[PDB]
Amino acid sequence: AGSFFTAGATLAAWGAAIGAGGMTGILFSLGASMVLGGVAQMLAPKARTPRIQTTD
Amino acid sequence: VFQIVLGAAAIAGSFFTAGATLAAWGAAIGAGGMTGILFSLGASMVLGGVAQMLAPKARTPRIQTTD
Amino acid sequence: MQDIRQETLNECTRAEQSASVVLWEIDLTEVGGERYFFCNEQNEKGEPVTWQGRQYQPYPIQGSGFELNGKGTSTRPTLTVSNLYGMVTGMAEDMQSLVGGTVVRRKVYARFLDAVNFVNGNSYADPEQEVISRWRIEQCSELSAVSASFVLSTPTETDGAVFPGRIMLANTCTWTYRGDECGYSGPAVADEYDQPTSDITKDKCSKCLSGCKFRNNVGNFGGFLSINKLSQ
Amino acid sequence: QIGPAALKAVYDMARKGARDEIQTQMRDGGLFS
Amino acid sequence: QIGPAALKAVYDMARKGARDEIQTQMRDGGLFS
Amino acid sequence: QIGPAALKAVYDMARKGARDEIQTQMRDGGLFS
Amino acid sequence: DKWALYVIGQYCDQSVPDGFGGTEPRITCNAYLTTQRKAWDVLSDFCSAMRCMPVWNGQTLTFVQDRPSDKTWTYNRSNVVMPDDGAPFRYSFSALKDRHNAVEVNWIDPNNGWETATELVEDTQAIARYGRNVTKMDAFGCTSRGQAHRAGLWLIKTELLETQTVDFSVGAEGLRHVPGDVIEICDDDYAGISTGG
Amino acid sequence: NYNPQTRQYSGIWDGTFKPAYSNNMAWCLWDMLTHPRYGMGKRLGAADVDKWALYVIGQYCDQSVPDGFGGTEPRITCNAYLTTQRKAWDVLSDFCSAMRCMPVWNGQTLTFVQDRPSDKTWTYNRSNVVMPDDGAPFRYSFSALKD
Amino acid sequence: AHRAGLWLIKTELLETQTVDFSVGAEGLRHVPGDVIEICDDDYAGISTGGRVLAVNSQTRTLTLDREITLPSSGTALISLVDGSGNPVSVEVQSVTDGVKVKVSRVPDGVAEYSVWELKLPTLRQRLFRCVSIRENDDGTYAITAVQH
Amino acid sequence: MKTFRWKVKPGMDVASVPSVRKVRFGDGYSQRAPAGLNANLKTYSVTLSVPREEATVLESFLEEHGGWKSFLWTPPYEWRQIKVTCAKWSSRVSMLRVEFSAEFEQVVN
Amino acid sequence: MKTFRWKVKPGMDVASVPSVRKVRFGDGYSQRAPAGLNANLKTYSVTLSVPREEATVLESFLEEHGGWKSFLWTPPYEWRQIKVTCAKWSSRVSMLRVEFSAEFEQVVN
Amino acid sequence: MKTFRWKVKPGMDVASVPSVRKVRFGDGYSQRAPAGLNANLKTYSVTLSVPREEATVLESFLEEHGGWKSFLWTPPYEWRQIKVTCAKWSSRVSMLRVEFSAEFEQVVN
Amino acid sequence: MKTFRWKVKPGMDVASVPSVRKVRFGDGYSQRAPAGLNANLKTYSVTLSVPREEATVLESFLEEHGGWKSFLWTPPYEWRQIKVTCAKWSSRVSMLRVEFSAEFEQVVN
Ligand code: SF4
């Protein structure tokens, strides 16, 4: 979210070294993405309900 | 000097992008005449099944509980 | 917490640890093939790696996408192998592209390997130290003149399955011929076209009512011979 | 190319590509994304 | 920047962008992706 | 790396990643994208 | 393309076993469209009832019917572009669960009553191999049991037989190719010998 | 060793299933997963699903809790009537949501992670975790206001 | 029905935060749904964990990096790993210069550069349950967890 | 014409860089195959020094071939006639002479 | 052929760079493992200088292997015979001699 | 062994580059924290010149340690024994002597 | 300690680079603003040279701040005492002296 802390660590060593086979870049921690639907969705699959029909 | 053409192993882990090493393409950056990143459509075009590459697979009306 | 021994726990916490080798096994017995054993490395004597008395041949192989998660899609690993000299090609044209095979992956610290692999021998050799995982082959994603790539899936993978499965039908049987639900064990009678045959290799039920009658099995018919008129 | 400034630009181009592709898939055949 | 290691990083950033963009299109107005 | 040639390559990689992601989200759990 | 539709109609008019001892045209109409669907939906329904696929040729909108056709050209590794990696011909396969072995086709019976009857088509040989993958389909114009069974069997046979795909980007001659052209691939790497140059 | 009428287990189980009628939703899920005729027994099959996890899940679901009418009641119970063919994932998610668990491929078997009060298994400080370039050994995130 | 709704509401109201703390080679021990305590000295205002520099079995004492301060009331505890990878716990008796601690008993096999933790009488444990573990094709495992 | 008929300066570079199929992951086992059939086609970095008047003839030749249209050439390296093309051929026009710097990538077709 | 016979004059460069698995913990602590199972391969940046007639023989020998394939060599560093592969072998021509530069990578194969 | 017992050349580089937590947006306020506990571990670019015979012993030592397996070393900078690892150690083999160019990254574990 | 006492010999490099907000309008017109609120900070590329014994003292002083933290210094440019932070302080060792290179960044903190 913004080029704010990519320049915080400055990624100088990784950028100048590009990387390596053994270690992997761009891990993208799963903090916010996994919790977007709610914490209760991270523990139970949240069963669904049938589509509402106006006929009834 | 070549055509790279990304396959399916290159897009699945940095495994064969370093197999061909893309050295000439990477050091040459590119050219107007030739295009990079072609992305062969083998696995993507067959995801739904082979029979979907030959017929459009007509759909069916939505099931209603009222019936 | 995985059922892994205490020696592996001791080795994990050490600052300077031995190399962690990964040994792969391809099992096509359930689909009509043999078992192949692979390791990305040889040993110090230039020989295939001997683990638990089994020789894992040298061959370039590496996996990725291995993770344990519950929320979201079932995890699909991937296994990249070398297709120089057309070995995997030979399998693909032979074993239906290896689909349905079983890939077993073992993680072993090199310190616990058999003493054969080392010139000086191994005092800490302990063939019980390993971490095992099983997966299935879902699709040979790529197969070129250079390499091959396989998509792996968990053996459960409830993707195309439905529940309940048995379907109400008329003029057709949903049972498996000579299966437990069908319950038939008689001699050869006819083929799938209701043609009378005495050959056991050409004996298959037509799944229609007449095919059931040919075997006097109408009591076990999987269909429902009244529902066609009630649905009008 | 410095890593900090390059990663944000690459991320924004990725977001734009996702927009373009999602809107493309809402066409006739597509996938309706 | 070597091509091999850069292309995979770009691909992974693009997939993360697809994550974020689909999830943000499932918001109120959006497109429901 | 020149900007002109690199930006199109990044855009196409992003489009391919969006394709892969939209297809992989229609799997069992996923989100159906 | 009216000539493509002409050949398609000739193919659809061929006589095939009825299954009741008689004969029947291969594919037939008798649809009653009543609800306004998008034109793409109706076009896809028509092009799925007979196994064709609409493609803009470049001058006309042609249809590529799945028919047994002859080889138009032959490509070896001396006639195709070589990328950095030595893969002139890349190959791919259909997934395990995308090879369906049981189909439920919904047709409309004109005999019992004009209602939806489900016809089940199975390949027990393939069920012993790829587990058991089931699908549902709507045969668009079907009113005859034989046509519904034929549609389901075509789907099953295509999934079981046709398995792999190839990407083999070629040189300047590619302008000769319309989609739906059968070509032979002579890859010396796939074989154990050399058969072209 | 499980008597469904009293919903009381005797002792150690050691496997060896028994054909008895029970309302235990965990074993209803077990039947759904490993039944060859209509369920998912042809695919998958036994020895692929963790039976001991389901055993503990059933024991948890059989505990007595206040009924709300002055009595007692088992914690979680079945009595579903599945009539419409939904995908196996839909039914599996419904079962795994009725009891607060989550199916995960352990690596050898398909385990279930029930939301239960459990004890600490390990302890991690900043001297036992990987340090990235930025000094954030532990990154934290929060659920949204409207979630 | 009320219990299901109440469990959802209570989980949403109580369980709030999640953590990503990708770990070293030991991550192969973790199955999703394992509860783990996180002792972060940055989250707290003090230091409550580190490595063991040296162990003196006689006049039983330990040398610890950083500085450890004992609480005014009650007693603190120190968790060490023994020679069998078992996390034993001992009671802290007296810390001299914040580097030299004296405990009731030094467990056998406690090697140098092993992990030690501190448990004060007035500190919450801060447990988290794992939800996803990813191998990083490097030897490190990426672990995501949520409050417990 | 179809034959480069000029004489090159002493210092000339000959790169080879053969094309092979190499498979290796990490530091494990390695496999090598000879890929194509026409091995390596090398590359001759060539320099010429010509009087200011024949520069017109040399550049007319090179521009007539114009990147495509390989021509026959006998390199003093192996003295065996081959077919090559040139794509850059920059020039440096001194007071009395001109120095051509070109590349020759040998071909088959 | 199998054995490299020519001699390397000026002083080669020998590069080891063993591949390891490294984890950086928090306050200065680390974790190190040898990654691979066997040894370290080591590579030789090597230069030859040969008369203008032996250069054809040298190029033919280096071409018959063609990037892949391994030939024996006894480096003047440890004096133990090893198997190496060469994939570049650039060459610069002069009036009476040809100077070769190459990168011999030692392989277990 | 566990102790590097060779003598280094006069010119030796010592980089420090401490690791800190720095927060600053644009040109506004800045905050600095000492990050980890074990400060900076420095890095010693070291060069050695040994006869052609002791090169084998030195390289055998370095390759036995092989990137991991830190060893004890007493740099002539502060004359205080520390623990270091080496990962590259290239070598240049002259006619009578050899020159090692290596890096020593000081560690804790 | 607080004050930097060692002297800087050769002639430092003083870099200003003030941060501004700049908008480029159309036909040659523009818009410029100072972006920040408080002056410009300025940085000094500085080199020390000290006997082999004082180098330990210099390194200890620079380590006690460890990248973060600010020490007082009076540059021989404007002769006004300022607060600086140093985060590199590379050092090259010689036979009788040690030469330090550093980047002192002036901070308002
Ligand atoms: S029709 Fe009768 S004999 Fe045939 S499979 Fe069904 S039950 Fe068996």
UniProtKB/Swiss-Prot annotation, chain A:
It comes from the Viruses. It is found in: Host cytoplasm. Plays a role in distal tail tip complex assembly. The tail tip complex is assembled successively with three tail tip proteins J, one tail tip protein I, one tail tip protein L and one tail tip protein K. The tail tip complex interacts with tail measure protein to initiate tail tube assembly. The formation of the tail tip complex is completed by the addition of tail tip protein M, which is followed by tail tube polymerization. May be excluded form tail tip during maturation and would be absent from virions. Belongs to the lambda-like tail tip protein I family. This is Tail tip assembly protein I. It comes from Escherichia phage lambda. The lineage of its organism: Viruses, Duplodnaviria, Heunggongvirae, Uroviricota, Caudoviricetes. The chain holds residues 113 to 168 of 223 of the full protein.
Curated annotation (Swiss-Prot), chain C:
InterPro entries: Phage_lambda_L. Changing C173S: Complete loss of tail assembly. Its main location: virion. It is found in: Virion; Host cytoplasm. Disulfide bonds: none annotated. Its cofactor is [4Fe-4S] cluster. Changing C212S: 96% loss of tail assembly. One of its GO terms (molecular function) is 4 iron, 4 sulfur cluster binding. Binds 1 [4Fe-4S] cluster. Keywords: 4Fe-4S, Host cytoplasm, Iron, Iron-sulfur, Late protein, Metal-binding, Viral genome ejection through host cell envelope, Viral long flexible tail ejection system, Viral penetration into host cytoplasm, Viral release from host cell, Viral tail assembly, Viral tail protein, Virion, Virus entry into host cell. Part of the distal tail tip complex which plays a role in DNA ejection during entry, and in tail assembly initiation during exit. The tail tip complex is assembled successively with three tail tip proteins J, one tail tip protein I, one tail tip protein L and one tail tip protein K. The tail tip complex interacts with tail measure protein to initiate tail tube assembly. The formation of the tail tip complex is completed by the addition of tail tip protein M, which is followed by tail tube polymerization. Belongs to the lambda-like tail tip protein L family. This is Tail tip protein L.
From Swiss-Prot, chains D, E, F:
It is found in: Virion. Cleaved into mature protein H* by an unidentified protease. Signal peptide: none annotated. Interacts with the tail initiator complex presumably through its C-terminus domain. Interacts with the tail assembly protein G. Interacts with the tail assembly protein GT. Belongs to the Lambdavirus tape measure protein family. Serves as a ruler that controls the length of tail by stopping the tail tube polymerization and is probably released from the tail shaft during infection to facilitate DNA translocation into the host cell. Assembles into a multimeric linear form possibly stabilized by the covering tail assembly proteins G and GT. Its C-terminus fixes the tail tip complex (J, I, L, K), thereby forming the tail assembly initiator complex. Tail tube proteins polymerize around tape measure protein, displacing the tail assembly protein G and GT. This is Tape measure protein. It comes from Escherichia phage lambda. The gene is H.
UniProtKB/Swiss-Prot annotation, chain G:
It is found in: Virion; Host cytoplasm. Coiled coil: none annotated. Belongs to the Caudoviricetes tip attachment protein J family. Attaches the virion to the host receptor LamB, inducing viral DNA ejection. During tail assembly, initiates distal tail tip assembly by interacting with gpI, gpL and gpK. During virus entry to host cell, binds strongly to host LamB in an irreversible attachment. The binding induces structural changes in the tail leading to viral DNA injection through LamB trimeric pore. Interacts with host LamB. This is Tip attachment protein J. It comes from Escherichia phage lambda (Bacteriophage lambda).
